[PDB]
Design a protein around this ligand. Structure first.
Ligand SMILES: [Ca+2]
Ligand SMILES: [Ca+2]
Ligand SMILES: [Ca+2]
Ligand SMILES: [Ca+2]
Ligand SMILES: [Cl-]
Ligand SMILES: [Cl-]
Lengths: 5, 236, 236, 5
C-alpha cells in the first residue's frame, strides 16, 4: 500500500 | 549533541542542501539539531524534519524487508542451514531502524507535541508519532507488540479527532493522516474493512470539498486523493 | 576493528546480504573486515569489495557535485551572500569522501597489492588504486593535486602494462581498466586526445578478439565495449 | 563519461 511523504 | 554549536538557521539551510544532495542521514541530523534548539518549527521546517526521517527509515524498512524475506525462506522445509548470519544481520538492521524510530518519537515527546497548539502542527506531529510507532510495529514480535500497535492507533486517533474538528476534508495533512491510518488498519491491525471504509469516506468527503480550492490547492489535495484511490484499487 | 570478532566467511556472507539489501556502507564495512583477516581475496571477493566501495563513494561523489555546483553559483556576479554554510557542508562531504578513498587505498597498500601475484588480481587492485586516486583528484585543489594526479596515472599505467602483457584484449578487467584510464585522461589530466585514442584502440583490439569467446564471455566483453563506444560518442 | 563497476 501507498503511504503519504 | 554534535549540532549544539551550529546556529538554528544554519542547520535549516544545511538540511535543505542535504535534501538537494540526497544526503538524508545528514538532513535528519541537521533537523534533529534544529529541533533541539527548543523553538517551535514552522510549516516548512516540519516538512523538512518529516522528509528527512521518512527517507532514512524508508531505506531501513526496504532493507529489513529484503532480509526478513531471505530469513523466512531459510526457515522453510528443505532449506539448507546457513548459520546465524541472516538472522544476525536482519537484527542489526532492525535495531538501527528501531533506534531511528526511537529518536523521532523522542523529539516528538521532548517537546514538539506538547508545545504544538495549532491544529496544523499538532496533527502533523501526532501523525508522525503514529507513523513511527507503525514502523516499530512492522518489525515487532515480542511482549510489547500489542502496546506498540495501540500506541500507533492512539496517536493516529487523536490526530484524526483534531483534524476532523479543525481542518477541511481536503487539507493535505488531514488527507495524508487518513491515508496512513488506513494503511495501519490494513497492514498492522488486521482490519482491512476499516482500512477500506476510511479510505473511501476520506476520498469522498475530499471530492465534495474540491470546489472550494484554488488550482494550486486542488493539485495538492488530488495528489493524495490518488494514493487513496490506488490503495482502494489494490484492496478491492 | 569492529569486524575483528566475526568469521571471514560470515563477513563475506553478510556482504552478499547487504548488497541484496542495497546497504552498501554495511557491505563495505563487512568487506573491509574480510580484507583485514589477512588472506588473499578470490575473484568473487574482489568484486564484492569493489562493488561496495564503488557504491559508497558514488553516492558521496554525486552529493559533492551537487554541493560544488551550488557553491560555484554562490560565487558568481550578483549572487547574494548566504554565509559559510554551503562551503562548510561541501567540505564535510568532501572530507568524508576523502576518508573513504584513504580507507580503500590503505587496504590496497596493507597488503592486498603486495601479495597479489596473478595478473587478474594485481591488475584489479592497481585499477582500484588508480580509481580512488582519481576520485581524490576530482576534489583536489591544493599543493598535492599534482601528486594525487600522478599517483592515479602511475597506478593505471602499471595496471595497463601488466594487462597488455598478461591478459587478452577482451578481458573485462583489462577493458574496465582502459575505460577508466581513458576517463582519467579526459576528466583529470586535461588530455582528451589521449582519452579518445585509448578508447578507440581498446575497442578495436577487443573487437578483433571477440571471435575467440564463448557466448557468455562475449556478453561480458561487449558490455564494457559499449561504454567505450558511449564515451567516444560523447567526446567526438 | 561512463566509468566501469
Ligand atoms: Ca543562536
Ligand atoms: Ca466486507
Ligand atoms: Ca577464523
Ligand atoms: Ca585532435
Ligand atoms: Cl551483523
Ligand atoms: Cl557542515
Amino acid at each position: 500500500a501507498h503511504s503519504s511523504x | 549533541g554534535a549540532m549544539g554549536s551550529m546556529e538554528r538557521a544554519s542547520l535549516i539551510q544545511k538540511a535543505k542542501l542535504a535534501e538537494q544532495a540526497e544526503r538524508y542521514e545528514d538532513m535528519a541530523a541537521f533537523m534533529k539539531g534544529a529541533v533541539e534548539k527548543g523553538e517551535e518549527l514552522s510549516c516548512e521546517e516540519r516538512n523538512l524534519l518529516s522528509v528527512a526521517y521518512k527517507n532514512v527509515v524508508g531505506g531501513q524498512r526496504a532493507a529489513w524487508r529484503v532480509l526478513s524475506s531471505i530469513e523466512q525462506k531459510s526457515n522453510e522445509e528443505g532449506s539448507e542451514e546457513k548459520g546465524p548470519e541472516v538472522r544476525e544481520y536482519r537484527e542489526k538492521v532492525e535495531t538501527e531502524l528501531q533506534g531511528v524510530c526511537d529518536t523521532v518519537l523522542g523529539l516528538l515527546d521532548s517537546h514538539l507535541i506538547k508545545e504544538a497548539g495549532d491544529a496544523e502542527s499538532r496533527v502533523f506531529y501526532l501523525k508522525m508519532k503514529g507513523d513511527y510507532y507503525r514502523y516499530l510495529a512492522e518489525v515487532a514480535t515480542g511482549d510489547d507488540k500489542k502496546r506498540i500497535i495501540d500506541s500507533a492507533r492512539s496517536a493516529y486517533q487523536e490526530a484524526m479527532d483534531i483534524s476532523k474538528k479543525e481542518m477541511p476534508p481536503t487539507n493535505p495533512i488531514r488527507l495524508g493522516l487518513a491515508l496512513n491510518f488506513s494503511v495501519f488498519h490494513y497492514e498492522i491491525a488486521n482490519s482491512p474493512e476499516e482500512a477500506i471504509s476510511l479510505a473511501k469516506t476520506t476520498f469522498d468527503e475530499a471530492m465534495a470539498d474540491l470546489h472550494t480550492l484554488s488550482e494550486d490547492s486542488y493539485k495538492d489535495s488530488t495528489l493524495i486523493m490518488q494514493l487513496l484511490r490506488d490503495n482502494l484499487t489494490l484492496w478491492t
